[PDB]
Amino acid sequence: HWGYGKHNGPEHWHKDFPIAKGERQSPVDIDTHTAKYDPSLKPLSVSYDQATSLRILNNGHAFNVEFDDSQDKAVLKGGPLDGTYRLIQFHFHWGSLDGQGSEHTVDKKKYAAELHLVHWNTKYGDFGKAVQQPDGLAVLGIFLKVGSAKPGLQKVVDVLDSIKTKGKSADFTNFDPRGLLPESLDYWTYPGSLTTPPLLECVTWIVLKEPISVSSEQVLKFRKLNFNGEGEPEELMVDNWRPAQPLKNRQIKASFK
Numbered sequence: 283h284w285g286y287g288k289h290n291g292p293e294h295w296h297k298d299f300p301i302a303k304g305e306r307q308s309p310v311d312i313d314t315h316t317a318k319y320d321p322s323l324k325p326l327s328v329s330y331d332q333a334t335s336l337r338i339l340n341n342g343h344a345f346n347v348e349f350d351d352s353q354d355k356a357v358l359k360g361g362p363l364d365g366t367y368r369l370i371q372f373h374f375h376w377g378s379l380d381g382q383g384s385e386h387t388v389d390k391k392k393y394a395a396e397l398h399l400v401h402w403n404t405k406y407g408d409f410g411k412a413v414q415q416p417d418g419l420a421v422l423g424i425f426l427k428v429g430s431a432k433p434g435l436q437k438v439v440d441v442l443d444s445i446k447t448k449g450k451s452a453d454f455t456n457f458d459p460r461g462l463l464p465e466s467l468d469y470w471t472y473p474g475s476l477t478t479p480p481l482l483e484c485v486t487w488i489v490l491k492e493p494i495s496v497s498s499e500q501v502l503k504f505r506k507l508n509f510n511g512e513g514e515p516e517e518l519m520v521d522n523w524r525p526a527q528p529l530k531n532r533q534i535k536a537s538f539k
């Protein structure tokens with residue numbers, strides 16, 4: 283099946299998922315000089331105060347912190363979005379080295395990792411229906427650079443030992459995703475896709491301009507995870523990122539001057 287190795291990696295995905303070569307694929311390089319300020323873009327509304335985290339899961343491609351999305355508890359609104367998008371999970375992509383790991387790039391610069399907070403449009407009833415719609419998902423992307431520790435990330439780091447291998451999960455309640463945000467909510471936005479198979483073209487991407495900083499020890503713990511299941515040959519979960527795809531007929535808009 284698909285993955286991030288030499289034989290099943292991003293260059294191979296198109297054979298099972300032809301949309302890999304589609305018109306609105308993600309991630310992309312954000313050329314800061316070509317992005318256009320859109321003064322009509324509304325401020326982002328991040329309402330995470332009632333967030334209910336449930337569980338953390340190693341799915342063999344990344345780890346997801348999952349949320350109760352059966353009510354409007356943690357929602358994203360505003361910005362380029364019409365309507366209400368519920369937080370269903372977040373996860374990260376990261377590198378084997380600090381100089382790579384992010385999926386989006388900024389003027390070709392790669393960050394050490396990238397956080398994706400995944401939300402779905404409530405007008406479609408459930409996540410499975412939403413991914414079938416061009417405005418079904420909104421993913422808030424946040425870059426990570428290595429420097430000072432991110433205190434709000436530490437709870438996540440400390441449970442990773444319990445979900446080392448594919449298919450392992452652990453209770454993960456009472457986690458506050460607000461602790462993963464940078465100070466500024468200035469963003470770029472463009473229409474795009476899931477960055478892993480099935481690569482569905484259903485995502486409004488909202489990528490924050492300001493990265494968060496995490497410590498070397500924090501990212502090192504990400505890199506101790508495994509792609510494999512328990513009792514299979516050990517393959518470190520690193521470099522689980524798709525490279526930038528062609529922008530094609532799209533304009534990246536900026537919320538800031």
Ligand SMILES: NS(=O)(=O)c1ccc(NC(=O)Cc2cccs2)cc1
Pocket residue numbers: 398400410413421475476477478479480
């Ligand atoms: N890296 S990303 O674009 O944020 C992303 C988010 C979610 C998924 N996949 C799923 O949530 C699982 C799916 C269920 C039904 C269709 S895809 C893949 C990539």
Ligand SMILES: [Zn+2]
Pocket residue numbers: 373374375398477
């Ligand atoms: Zn992702």
